[PDB]
Amino acid sequence: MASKAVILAGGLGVKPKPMVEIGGKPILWHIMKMYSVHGIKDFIICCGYKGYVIKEYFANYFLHMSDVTFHMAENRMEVHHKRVEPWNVTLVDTGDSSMTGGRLKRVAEYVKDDEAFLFTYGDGVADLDIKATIDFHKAHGKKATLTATFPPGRFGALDIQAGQVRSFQEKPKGDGAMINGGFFVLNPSVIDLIDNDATTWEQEPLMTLAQQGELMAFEHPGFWQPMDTLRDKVYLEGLWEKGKAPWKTWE
Amino acid sequence: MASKAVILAGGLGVKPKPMVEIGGKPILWHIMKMYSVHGIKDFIICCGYKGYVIKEYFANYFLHMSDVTFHMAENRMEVHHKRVEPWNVTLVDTGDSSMTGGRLKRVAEYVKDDEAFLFTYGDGVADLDIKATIDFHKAHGKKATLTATFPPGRFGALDIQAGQVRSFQEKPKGDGAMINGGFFVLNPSVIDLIDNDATTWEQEPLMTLAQQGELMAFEHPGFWQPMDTLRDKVYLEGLWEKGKAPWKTWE
Amino acid sequence: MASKAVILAGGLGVKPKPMVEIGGKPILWHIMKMYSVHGIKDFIICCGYKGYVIKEYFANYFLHMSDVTFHMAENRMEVHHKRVEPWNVTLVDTGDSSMTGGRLKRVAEYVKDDEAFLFTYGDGVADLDIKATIDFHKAHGKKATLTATFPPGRFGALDIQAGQVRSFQEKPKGDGAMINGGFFVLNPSVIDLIDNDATTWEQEPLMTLAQQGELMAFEHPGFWQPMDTLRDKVYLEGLWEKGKAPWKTWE
Amino acid sequence: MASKAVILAGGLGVKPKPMVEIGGKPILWHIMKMYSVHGIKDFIICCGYKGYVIKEYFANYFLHMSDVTFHMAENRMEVHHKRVEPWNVTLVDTGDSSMTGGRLKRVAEYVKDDEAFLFTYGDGVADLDIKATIDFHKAHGKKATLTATFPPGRFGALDIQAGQVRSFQEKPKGDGAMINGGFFVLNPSVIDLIDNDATTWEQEPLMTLAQQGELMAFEHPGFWQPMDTLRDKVYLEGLWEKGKAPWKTWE
Amino acid sequence: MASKAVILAGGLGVKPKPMVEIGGKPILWHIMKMYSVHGIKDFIICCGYKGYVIKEYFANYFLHMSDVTFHMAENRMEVHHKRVEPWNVTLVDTGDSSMTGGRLKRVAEYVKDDEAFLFTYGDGVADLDIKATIDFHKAHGKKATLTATFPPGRFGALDIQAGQVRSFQEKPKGDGAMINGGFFVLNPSVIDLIDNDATTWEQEPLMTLAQQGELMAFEHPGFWQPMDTLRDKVYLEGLWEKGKAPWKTWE
Amino acid sequence: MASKAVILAGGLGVKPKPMVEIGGKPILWHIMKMYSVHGIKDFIICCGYKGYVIKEYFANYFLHMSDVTFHMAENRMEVHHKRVEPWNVTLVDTGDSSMTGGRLKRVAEYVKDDEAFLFTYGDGVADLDIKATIDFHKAHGKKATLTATFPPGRFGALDIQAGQVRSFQEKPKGDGAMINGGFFVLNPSVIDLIDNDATTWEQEPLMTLAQQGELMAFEHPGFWQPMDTLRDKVYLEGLWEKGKAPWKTWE
């Protein structure tokens, strides 16, 4: 079925958001690893402002990733502890100014003839069963599927009763309504809902789909973390450092 | 009763967060205006890193705020359309590294002999009835009162049913549980719960109080906006520009 | 007659363009000195982005300009070699985004009831007879007068004949058509030609005036230099350093 | 005859001036395209400060220019919509401090045995008939030929008569004397007029040549734009965006 | 006798070197405190590049140094825990480019009619008996006196014998030859040895004096630390923080 | 015997210290040249923060080092005046935070089975007889050998007698005790003295060795210069420019 993952890496800026690291590696790579362990090895990167940074990275992938030896005499570069990644990574310049829907539209070409394809934000990691979501999408037959998740807390949480605060928790790990965690599974017709570069995916497209009854939610009550804040960064880095990263399911 | 407002303006950095403007004026000033219209005119500013910026501002208040004429010959500076503010503004250096509880402790001196005092974050504005909260605090007799509010949305909101997303809304204006909007009313004993500079208010102090049944919530279902993001900034600036700022209740 | 000089100091940015120095003093001050020696001592500064820089300067004029002694015990600051300037300097915030015409409009208030007033760019100096231009404007009775000047060369000048370059001169001191050197003398009705903040003076207003036959040119074949480039800067600074600044006509 | 184009890309700084883009491509590339459409495909780039930037660009030419796919498994990079450029591009480090004449001297080696060669500034584009200028140079038999052009306006243009400004135009498209538009055609003996690194081409060399009657002018009354200012940049970018770039004569 | 201290605060840059802090106060202030406790309360500051920073500081001395209350209504600023300093502080602009001797020459005016005066670097602190050095200078009758000190270690120290390193110490607290610790006591005739702005004190002037037998050394085997490196900074800050600063001899 | 040189290039930051240039080449390269002329052609670079900069350099060695021609049509890059370096250069990421001993430990793998190996700082050059030091180390049979040198002066040097400064010299070329000039020759057992990443070589390891009588000193009374200061930089660059670099012993 679906075999390609489209990732958003444009927007604000410096380097692109997905280039921010964790454990010395761009978050973008962490997400690629997530898909890859779920058998998805074809990637399309929607680049924007500072995109070349992303290009340079992949163009010098091993140099970035490992220790090397330059055998000058032979004009050869030896990679130590080389860990090959059987990926196809397409880097598409999608516009310095495009919106999320716009970027997707831009890459239509690359997924236009697939049953379904995966699409996600370049800043969120999780221990999500990618395969599961695919099968789920196939099963429900809708045009689209999103991964619903519990968000990080950004404020001081309150347990109020009778005007009395029974309990107080500073930025707790989200426990009410699930939100858009990204990790979409989509049919290529969704692109038809995108008008142009200025289209924001989370706007008309998504609302319409929900509206049309064409949008399903795969609920993921488990680990999911976006990297928006420094606190996020630190949190994520700690997890990684401590050897306790729930999204790191690979060898 | 309570007649002094303690405001947090330390932390991260550049200029201090409260110095970020809206309509050409630091948000900090907007908050001061909020209190001032509710009769609170004594202020204590907990300064940290880049604090001098805040000092310079108040030290050159009118120069910052209005058009002026320097009558050089007479060594006089004339202020056009001068709008006097009958305030007492104390600027206290509370530490480059202190935590929120730490900063409060630092300024104990200044409120230690008051029935109660006001305390708030230097980054949130609202159309809150300050007087109301005071009276409310007096009435309930607890050690502390906080203002509960509906937070801004940071993610794509979902209406799910039977795995189907009935509706999708990108970062909607918060509609479930109220959170810590700040705007506290406190008795000086709360300070006793603060151990040192590294104490984070939202931690032990607050949890304890709730825990001890010493923490009440004044619910404010209306306008409240923190300035955390640029989107926040833009939103706030628009409101201000458009002449539609709910927190601007003054003349 | 005319007794006030309106100076443009908004636009791009860092510090405001007029704040760039020559001989350790902002060019703006050099221009003020030019007017001042011609008896003009009332100034209106149209401030924009970074305007406060200008405000701080005038607010700490002597501190900026001379050596000082702080008699701490007496809370007194003594100025060495103090050189008083009997000026009235109005600093008006004219908008971060306004155009030149827009800024002028903004300050209408300040010259609205004068026979005529002076207006100029905050980046050009010259050995112009200010009084002369005033009298000239009074004499011709038109709504407006501008100072026409020979511009600095920005390219390699050519003397061609019969396809042959007879002579080549790199960025020569301008010798054909005079251009807008600024230094205007105007009647307050010109303001009526300004629609809003976005009005660029050099556009509709000026073209109309010329068009209406309401615009005269006081030709200044002598010294006039704008500070646009670094080369300009260096040139100007050299002149100043060498004690050969044609615009420095004061004591 | 002449088959190599020498381009100046040193001087001030950040990235080199010629690296500034238009339509996402360095202006330098636009100029190369100009020559290339006129059959000139051998280039010599006089690099200076930040030169490596230029080197990296050419070294990763397609990566910079197009969308790519990294077939990781095969260690292959696939270029989408590849547009080959049959050029030879020599990058010579000509000194961080050298002057224009100095840089040329530096590259003598590369054109020393040619009938004639082309030389130009890395910041100006035009719809110039390169071939035409070559033939013209061959025809006149002089040591040197330059392209004369109408410059952009930097000031407010005036139509004065009898002290009256008949018309006013803000920075009009130049209509008097033609200037040095660059785009030279030269015989290698001109190098003999260059003494060292500090030689500025537009100085002694050029003046001498004119002086010696060895300098001809190919007048180009048409499109020619240098990129000196941001206004220039914007103007150029607009033209390009609008699909109305007179210098873009290629497919 | 000597009653004025001349301090060097020009050179490299950002803020001036002497403005770098320790315990939240510019090192410059620490040195002033050193003199002040030894009865020296008249200061002359040789300012250079970024000098205004120094000016602003003294101009807003208490605002910088303490907590304040702005009694807006009364246009009054109240200083908390005010600690008056009965100093006279002259700030002289001595040139962005001048050398140390040059700066001194610049301020001749200010000490020209004193028996002797003090002169020092704005970056070194110590527990030196200032009075002692004065008396010493008076006693020896030479034109000049310098304070000799043991310098901080910048390298790995070695105890070698017979090619064997008996002991190794990383950047130890200096134990061989004393160096120029500054803290000079001078007669005004030394100025005659200074030719111009480009004169470096430590060059001709000092060598000559030694040479002429006009230079004495007051040896200070105790505490003396220059702030050149960050390590220096950290070291100094630690000392200060720990309440173990040997130079802090005041109340 | 010893055939590999381990070089420290981590620490503070921007680019890595060893990347700072002299004569347009990173100092690191100068040191490599020093070893290389002494027959040492196997290198191990201990990288830290900004390490990739070092990686990119070696990965694009000739592009950095020489003039090139890109034969686009053939996808070939031609190097002019190519000067091959028969080196093996290993780049190991040794930690953003590691200490000098820590970094060495990190690379143990690479020298663990050698009789001895060379180790040095990436910021010091000299006309040292590398071979000599090796033979010397072999001869003395100790675990370690260091190169002792005379350091640059950082202060004003004094010749005192009887309280009188007989002579004064500003930052003279060091003439008392030799210091740690680096350029070590070591047996791999020294690594056993390194506990972790936080180990500073110059601490426990070195002191112990000296202490244990396992540390010898090869005294180099000749040319040795570290690049710590800008003055250092300038000095070194001058030497290089003037064609008088004592460390440049190669062709």
Ligand SMILES: Nc1ccn([C@@H]2O[C@H](COP(=O)(O)OP(=O)(O)O[C@H]3O[C@H](CO)[C@@H](O)[C@H](O)[C@H]3O)[C@@H](O)[C@H]2O)c(=O)n1
């Ligand atoms: N014009 C833009 C903006 C963003 N992005 C990319 O999209 C990803 C996410 O962007 P973001 O973090 O700024 O977006 P968000 O504000 O966090 O919100 C998005 O991500 C949230 C989950 O983290 C969703 O709940 C929300 O609905 C969705 O809009 C990033 O990798 C970014 O590079 C992009 O390609 N183009």
Ligand SMILES: Nc1ccn([C@@H]2O[C@H](COP(=O)(O)OP(=O)(O)O[C@H]3O[C@H](CO)[C@@H](O)[C@H](O)[C@H]3O)[C@@H](O)[C@H]2O)c(=O)n1
């Ligand atoms: N060490 C620190 C950190 C912050 N602040 C000040 O405190 C205010 C708020 O700081 P922030 O925006 O970083 O804090 P927050 O993450 O937004 O969270 C705070 O504000 C939220 C409401 O906006 C609350 O719900 C939450 O419980 C409370 O911790 C700012 O004016 C800041 O200058 C301070 O004085 N010292």
Ligand SMILES: Nc1ccn([C@@H]2O[C@H](COP(=O)(O)OP(=O)(O)O[C@H]3O[C@H](CO)[C@@H](O)[C@H](O)[C@H]3O)[C@@H](O)[C@H]2O)c(=O)n1
């Ligand atoms: N929005 C803007 C732009 C500029 N300025 C002020 O106007 C002065 C001149 O601005 P500029 O140097 O950018 O303007 P220009 O491009 O040099 O052109 C102006 O000045 C030229 C003479 O120097 C005139 O010939 C020309 O007609 C007139 O438009 C500066 O002090 C600047 O601060 C301003 O207040 N607001």
Ligand SMILES: Nc1ccn([C@@H]2O[C@H](COP(=O)(O)OP(=O)(O)O[C@H]3O[C@H](CO)[C@@H](O)[C@H](O)[C@H]3O)[C@@H](O)[C@H]2O)c(=O)n1
């Ligand atoms: N030391 C220098 C200075 C400049 N350049 C290069 O030369 C080109 C033009 O430099 P520029 O824009 O600073 O020069 P200009 O002031 O615009 O003037 C030049 O270009 C003008 C046309 O644009 C000519 O009329 C003029 O005679 C000629 O000197 C740029 O690509 C620049 O990188 C260089 O290699 N080395």
Ligand SMILES: Nc1ccn([C@@H]2O[C@H](COP(=O)(O)OP(=O)(O)O[C@H]3O[C@H](CO)[C@@H](O)[C@H](O)[C@H]3O)[C@@H](O)[C@H]2O)c(=O)n1
């Ligand atoms: N052109 C210059 C350079 C420096 N300074 C001032 O002089 C002081 C010392 O300058 P520095 O630290 O750069 O000087 P140094 O290299 O440390 O050397 C000086 O200070 C050393 C003691 O710290 C002396 O031993 C040495 O002889 C003397 O030259 C600083 O406060 C600096 O602002 C100045 O006014 N003008």
Ligand SMILES: Nc1ccn([C@@H]2O[C@H](COP(=O)(O)OP(=O)(O)O[C@H]3O[C@H](CO)[C@@H](O)[C@H](O)[C@H]3O)[C@@H](O)[C@H]2O)c(=O)n1
């Ligand atoms: N954590 C650190 C610090 C430094 N370095 C590297 O080590 C070299 C030297 O570092 P530095 O100049 O900061 O060290 P130092 O303060 O100059 O001192 C070192 O070098 C001195 C000789 O220059 C020795 O006398 C001294 O004992 C030794 O510690 C540089 O190439 C640097 O990149 C490193 O890999 N990791």
Ligand SMILES: [Mg+2]
């Ligand atoms: Mg996000």
Ligand SMILES: [Mg+2]
């Ligand atoms: Mg906040």
Ligand SMILES: [Mg+2]
């Ligand atoms: Mg101008």
Ligand SMILES: [Mg+2]
């Ligand atoms: Mg140009």
Ligand SMILES: [Mg+2]
């Ligand atoms: Mg020093």
Ligand SMILES: [Mg+2]
């Ligand atoms: Mg070093």
